[PDB]
Structure 1
Amino acid sequence: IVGGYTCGANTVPYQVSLNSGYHFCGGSLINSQWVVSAAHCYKSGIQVRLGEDNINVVEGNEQFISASKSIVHPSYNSNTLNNDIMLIKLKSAASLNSRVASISLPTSCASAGTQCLISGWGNTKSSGTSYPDVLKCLKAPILSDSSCKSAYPGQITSNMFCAGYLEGGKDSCQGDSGGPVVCSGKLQGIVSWGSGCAQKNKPGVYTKVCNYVSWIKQTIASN
């Protein structure tokens, strides 16, 4: 997250870190057995880390649980990142408590101008690199689909939206991928892609979760 603030420990209790020896992507806990992330985060060997603030220090609220199954969206296209969503089932149920909690799925899509909370452990610099240990947060509005499509001509689909600031300075960045965009208490987006970080006229692009709620609910009920 560039241009954000330190969330504070366990203030985003649905935020997960996906770990394969190291943090590599965020995700969101949607019930005690299932995490939502980005399909471009797919890999074998995932351990889901719940209850994290500093990802390099064991602070007392963590739960580390291996993934038992990953399910990339049937229509994920890695060239275009259309349908950039994946489900991860935990080998054992998380213990839900205040520090570890699920986030609700949308019942309908969110509108342009709605403010959302984006979080993660990605890079905090817009030119160089600096990776935080503690979780970072950013408040950002959903942008109009026309400004999104104007920023990235030929690349935005109906399964994507942009959020952030066309003037630059505030955005998601490398390492935030897969993490949550929560608006009015619902998981509306997943950190998906962009061009650079926090650059002018290049806002972040996010998977539009509301289009996937039926697939999510059917998939978890059958798995």
Structure 2
Amino acid sequence: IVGGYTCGANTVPYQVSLNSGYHFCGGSLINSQWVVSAAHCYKSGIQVRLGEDNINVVEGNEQFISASKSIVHPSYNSNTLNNDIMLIKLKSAASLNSRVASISLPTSCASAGTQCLISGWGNTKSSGTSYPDVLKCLKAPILSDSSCKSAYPGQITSNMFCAGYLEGGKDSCQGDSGGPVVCSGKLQGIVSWGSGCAQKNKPGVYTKVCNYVSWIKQTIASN
């Protein structure tokens, strides 16, 4: 997260860190046994880390659970990143409390101008690599479809939306992929891609979760 602030320990209880010996992507807990992340974060040997704040120190509240299976959307396209969503089933259910809690899936899509909270342990520099130890947060609005398409002509599908600031300075970045974009208490987006980080007129692009709710429900119900 570039230009964001320190969230504060366990203030984003649905945030998870996907770990394979280091933090490589974020995710969102949607129930005690399932996490939603981005398809491009897929790899084998994923350990899901819940209740984290400093990812390099065991401070208490952490729950480390191995993924039992990861389900990348069948129509995921790695070249366009269309359908960049994945579900991860946990080997055992997580213990939910005030520090570890799930986030609700939306019933309707959000409108441009909606303010959302984006969080993660990704890079904090637009020009360089600085990864934080604790969780960073950023409040950002969803942009209109015309501004998004004007920024990335020919690259936005109906399963994506832009959120951020066109002036640059505040944005999600590498390491934040797969994490949550929460608006009014509902998970509306998944950090997916962008051109660099926090560059002027190049906002972040997110997977539009409202388009996948029946898919998520049906997939969880059959696995």
Structure 1 segments of 4 or more deviating over 2 A? none
Aligned length: 223
| Residue-by-residue CA offset, 1:60-81 (whole Å, 9 max, x unaligned) | 0000000001100011000000
Deviation (angstroms), 1:153 = 0.7
SS of 1:210's equivalent in the other structure is helix
Give the alignment's TM-score, normalised by structure 2.
Answer: 1.00
Tell me, in whole angstroms, the C-alpha distance in 2 between the residues paired with 1:40 and 1:154: 20
- In the aligned structure 1, how far is the partner of 2:70 from the partner of 2:120? 21
Give a deviation string over 1:131-153, Cα, whole Å, max 9, x none: 00000000000000110011001
Secondary structure in structure 1 of the residue aligned to 2:221: helix
Q: After superposition, what is the alpha-carbon deviation per residue over 1:105-150, rounded to whole angstroms, capped at 9, x for unaligned?
A: 0000000000000000000011111100000000000000110011
Question: TM-score normalised to the size of structure 1?
Answer: 1.00
The offset of 1:104, in angstroms, is 0.1
Once residues 73 and 126 of structure 1 are traced to their aligned partners in structure 2, the CA distance between those partners, rounded to angstroms, is 30
% identical aligned pairs: 100
Q: What is the aligned partner in structure 1 of residue 56 from structure 2? A: 56
The residue matched to 1:40 in structure 2 has which SS?
Answer: helix
Q: Distance in 2 between matches of 1:11 and 1:58?
A: 17
Backbone CA RMSD of aligned residues: 0.4
Distance 1:150 1:87 in 2: 31
What does 1:126-205 align with in structure 2 at a 5 Å threshold? 126-205=126-205
1:84 aligns with: 84
| Partner residue, 1:13 | 13
**Map of 1:119 onto structure 2:** 119
Match of 1:88, SS?
A: strand
List gaps (5 residues or longer) in structure 2: none
What displacement does 1:28 show?
0.1
Aligned equivalents of 2:126 and 2:92: distance in 1? 38
Measure the CA separation in 2 of the matches of 1:5 and 1:163.
Answer: 17
* Unmatched 5+ stretches in structure 1: none
Shift of 1:203: 0.3
How far apart in 2 are the matches of 1:125 and 1:136? 12
